[PDB]
């Protein structure tokens, strides 16, 4: 609310909110806020009438309703803005799919149902989840998304940088019956997003979180990759890059495994380090531990690719479902690698 204003008006609204703060008063704090509103009407030369009695009371009553109910009161402009941004993000994702040799079955606004090669699925997931939040570097036709908005030749249309987004991936044999393939895709993307909890901190406190993940499945293997690790998934221009940050790590690691700098034994050798590292309790200890686990399959001479130290302590939970999952994000990273390869 206080940020929604542009101009000296923000002072009035935040001091009203302070009058709403801690059940402070009505009919009483309507002076401090008013000794500025009347100041403002006297700050001009042609004002006609003021019923500040009614007006500041209604202005406080608005925010009081907002907070008591607990939701921004929706007006038609809200709906048409969300829907327009939905369609524009859809236009972005249409050429994001086409950027990765994909075939759209249904891409409409919020959702998506495409078919891509098993090779560029991770790239597409990353770039799509970022473009949904208006954060990208490509021109996608006539549309050049810019850090939370959608620039279209000087037109800055909004985006959905607050809305999370889940992702299901089914690595399927071309002879697999599409009935069960589509049903498994839908049932993962439904069950899992409601049923999984992964560690997140907002306000500096390790809490849980449910949506905005990426589930993978390969004929029995499953993995989940959290996409935000922040509950106001972005609130600054800073956190725009944090989106899908775990995915570029998996992409880099797959970039090392292919070129023959790491051996796929990496994907079968993390279990022994996992006991040590999840009971481990210091940062740089676990840092060196993963560095040397990789440095038994080697990544490089004079190692250069470490895991970015935000990935540890992240524990993924599940509400006791047949979907078995490792309780930690790095084991899920390596299962995502197993699932991607298993389809190549």
């Amino acid at each position: 609310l206080v940020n929604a204003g542009s101009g000296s008006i923000v002072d009035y609204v935040k001091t009203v909110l302070k009058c709403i703060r801690e059940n402070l008063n009505k009919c009483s704090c309507a002076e401090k806020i008013y000794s500025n509103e009347v100041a403002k009407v006297m700050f001009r030369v042609n004002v006609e009438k003021a019923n500040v009695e009614e007006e500041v009371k209604n202005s406080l009553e608005y925010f009081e309703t907002i907070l008591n109910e607990g939701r921004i009161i929706v007006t038609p402009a809200w709906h048409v803005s969300i829907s327009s941004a939905l369609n524009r993000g859809l236009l972005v994702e249409l050429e994001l799919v086409n950027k990765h040799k994909g075939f759209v079955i249904y891409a409409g606004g919020d959702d998506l149902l495409a078919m891509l090669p098993v090779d560029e699925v991770l790239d597409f997931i990353k770039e799509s989840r970022r473009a949904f939040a208006g954060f990208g570097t490509e021109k996608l036709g006539n549309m050049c998304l810019e850090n939370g908005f959608v620039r279209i030749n000087n037109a800055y249309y909004p985006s959905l940088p607050i809305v999370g987004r889940s992702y299901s991936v089914i690595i399927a044999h071309y002879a697999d019956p599409l009935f069960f393939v589509i049903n498994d895709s839908y049932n993962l993307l439904e069950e899992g997003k409601e049923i999984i909890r992964y560690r997140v901190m907002y306000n500096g406190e390790y809490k849980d979180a449910k949506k905005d993940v990426a589930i993978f499945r390969y004929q029995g293997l499953t993995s989940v990759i959290p996409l935000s690790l922040k509950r106001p998934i972005v609130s600054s221009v800073s956190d725009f890059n944090e989106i899908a940050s775990i995915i570029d790590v998996i992409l880099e690691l797959k970039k090392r495994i292919d070129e023959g700098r790491i051996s796929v034994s990496l994907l079968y050798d993390y279990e022994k380090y996992k006991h040590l590292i999840v009971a481990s309790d210091e940062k740089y200890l676990t840092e060196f531990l993963v560095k040397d686990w990789i440095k038994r399959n080697s990544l490089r001479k004079h190692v250069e690719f470490t895991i970015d130290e935000k990935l540890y302590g992240v524990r993924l939970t599940i509400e006791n479902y047949p979907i078995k999952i490792p309780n930690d994000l790095i084991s899920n990273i390596v299962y995502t690698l197993r699932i991607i390869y298993g389809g190549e």
């Binding site: 079968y268 050798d269 279990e271 022994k272």
Partner: protein
């Protein structure tokens, strides 16, 4: 006769041999030998087959079709191999 021929044989080590273990087991030795279910050293017939086949494909460069038939084609297989290797049991060790 499920099997046409049965060729039991001994494997006398000429030098010291090292068939490595494939395992996520953390052991003391960095590179241990292959172990059977009793912890004795053994040679997985996977390793017997791979090595003996890689050798035969060179000693007898003309009969590569007989070998590819009895021990399976390499890069584009259409059929099951006709020969089977049993895992090598330890039989006697020098002390």
């Amino acid at each position: 006769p499920y099997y046409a021929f049965a060729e039991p044989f001994f494997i006398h080590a000429i030098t010291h041999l090292h068939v490595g273990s494939g395992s996520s087991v953390e052991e003391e030795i960095a590179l241990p030998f292959q172990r059977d279910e009793l912890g004795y050293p053994t040679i997985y017939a996977s390793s017997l087959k791979g090595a003996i086949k890689s050798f035969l494909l060179k000693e007898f460069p003309d009969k590569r079709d007989v070998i590819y038939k009895v021990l399976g084609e390499d890069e584009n297989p259409e059929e099951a191999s006709l020969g089977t290797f049993l895992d090598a049991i330890l039989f006697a060790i020098p002390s």
